Design a protein around this ligand. Structure first.
Ligand SMILES: [Ca+2]
Ligand SMILES: [Ca+2]
Ligand SMILES: [Ca+2]
Ligand SMILES: [Ca+2]
Ligand SMILES: [Ca+2]
Lengths: 322, 322
């Protein structure tokens, strides 16, 4: 049950119980995208500006925006007044030399400081392999307990993002991983739905790799529609917390088709925290043609993209408000 | 100020508003004492036993005991029913290679787990140099905010221990450091007394190296008694929080003399988190004549030691109930 302040914050992040949030806390990933289109290293000024442009042009069409404290603070101050704010709390990436992918908060940040920076939610990404090293997972669970406790104290919603993996499978897009994905996703949600983690909303993957599902696949078919549908019902049965989907490994259209398939299957998901697909194309335009050009792209292609997603969400998502 | 549960825990940690706590969360430092008679590397059993012996024999005469989650959990279960329990949350020691001495919680622990382990307080040691790198201190302040937040959420008193140092002064006991100690201690207390850090009790050094104070000094004299007394008054005015003294670099007798002097100077300290000198003479006896001998040393010399300290506290310490 939400405290008064957490409920107020949840309300600021959604519309009629549905979270239609724009994810733009990309840091290293965004810089790498930018570097594709110019010779000089992308600058802090360029990065901050592009985030500000996306925030200004697209938040009128989003219930909230997720930004990073590193480059995203100016962008947060120019968001639509109707849109709420989440700030990321985790350091990006993971050590490729090991399989542990341990969580680490930004060095000079705390839940209190995230709140003071005007956020209505603390977001934190955790990599989790339910079948992995038990001592590694013990450390991960302890770390999430601390964060959930911070958020309880600061009275600010805790959005926990879970990205699954397997210590022994290098490629999550592989058929090998696809066969175990539902297990990884749904069992991880079951663990992190425990009261002791203090989570208010789970940001999670769809529990199936739709590219291998009958009727969605163009190549090999690993699952029938009924099998895929059962993975969604299992996911729904894994938690009683609000949860929202992130998009990965799929085209904007497939993600939208997945949202429809999810709702048809019985998943009562409560929205999305989705980004790249919507503003991606503006990065090239910003680098090559400049800010005003980027605005124009966002006002046209950007809007068209977010609009189509919104219409789908509007007919697929269920409200977290019971 | 204190919530109902924090106050109840605070009361379990003290007697008549005075904290006479036995500090015994030493880890590496204790097995190293056990160097006498190097019949192999000290056993985890031995370490857990000595801690249990000390706990069972001495806690009847202390208001609480501080243990480490590493070796001290068995010890904590055999503590007198009249003594409260603090558990250490920080990893011991620091990197000698660098000057940052960054804090770091025990990997598989959280304030929640500490509370679940039966503790009436979370204790955390932070090394702080008020004059050191500004970014390092930013990271340290953020870290303490997080812990302070955890403890608020779990509704458990937060005991912050501050050990001061200087990035550019190797020896803590040097005359050079002595000349700035009061500055380091008192200014750090001012910082961590701010509401945002959520500290309930400060465990701090006396703000002067008494080994250089007129009348207390065996060798050269750096300060008069009036200069020392003022440092104590400055310390009293650096915080409105309850604070207790740790004993460092001095004999049991000198520590006790310092308590008297502190009180005479106008310091309203609320007890101590000490006792290493009360059980110090049993470490050798334990690996010399076995468990039985140690118990006898504790029931005799041990008791005398802690009883003697208690009598000084009765004449010097002020109740935190203020
Ligand atoms: Ca609208
Ligand atoms: Ca308006
Ligand atoms: Ca539950
Ligand atoms: Ca459910
Ligand atoms: Ca007493």
């Amino acid at each position: 049950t939400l405290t008064e302040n957490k409920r107020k914050s949840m309300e600021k992040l959604s519309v009629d119980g549905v979270i239609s949030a724009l994810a733009f806390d990309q840091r290293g990933a965004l810089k790498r995208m930018m570097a594709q289109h110019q010779t000089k290293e992308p600058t802090v000024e360029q990065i901050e500006e592009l985030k500000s442009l996306v925030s200004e042009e697209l938040t009128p069409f989003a219930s909230s925006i997720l930004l990073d404290p590193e480059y995203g603070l100016p962008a947060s101050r120019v968001r639509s007044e109707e849109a709420g704010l989440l700030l990321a709390y985790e350091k990006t990436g993971y050590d490729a030399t090991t399989t542990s992918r341990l969580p680490d908060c930004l060095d000079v940040w705390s839940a209190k400081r995230i709140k003071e920076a005007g956020a209505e939610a603390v977001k934190f990404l955790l990599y989790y392999d339910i079948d992995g090293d038990q001592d590694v997972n013990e450390q991960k669970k302890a770390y999430i307990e601390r964060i959930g406790s911070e958020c309880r104290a600061e009275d600010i919603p805790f959005y926990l993002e879970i990205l699954t993996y397997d210590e022994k499978i290098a490629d999550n897009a592989s058929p090998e991983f696809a066969k175990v994905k539902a297990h990884k996703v749904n069992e991880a949600m079951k663990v992190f739905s425990k009261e002791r983690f203090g989570v208010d909303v789970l940001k999670v993957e769809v529990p199936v790799n739709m590219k291998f599902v009958e009727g969605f696949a163009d190549g090999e078919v690993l699952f029938t529609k009924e099998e895929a549908a059962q993975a969604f019902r299992d996911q729904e049965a894994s938690t009683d917390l609000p949860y929202i989907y992130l998009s990965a490994g799929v085209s904007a259209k497939l993600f939208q088709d997945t949202l429809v398939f999810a709702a048809e299957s019985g998943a009562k998901f409560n929205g999305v925290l989705c980004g790249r697909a919507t503003w991606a194309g503006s990065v090239k335009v910003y680098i090559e043609e400049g800010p005003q050009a980027a605005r124009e792209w966002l006002r046209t292609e950007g809007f068209k993209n977010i609009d189509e997603l919104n219409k789908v969400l509007d007919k697929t998502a269920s409200p977290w408000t019971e």
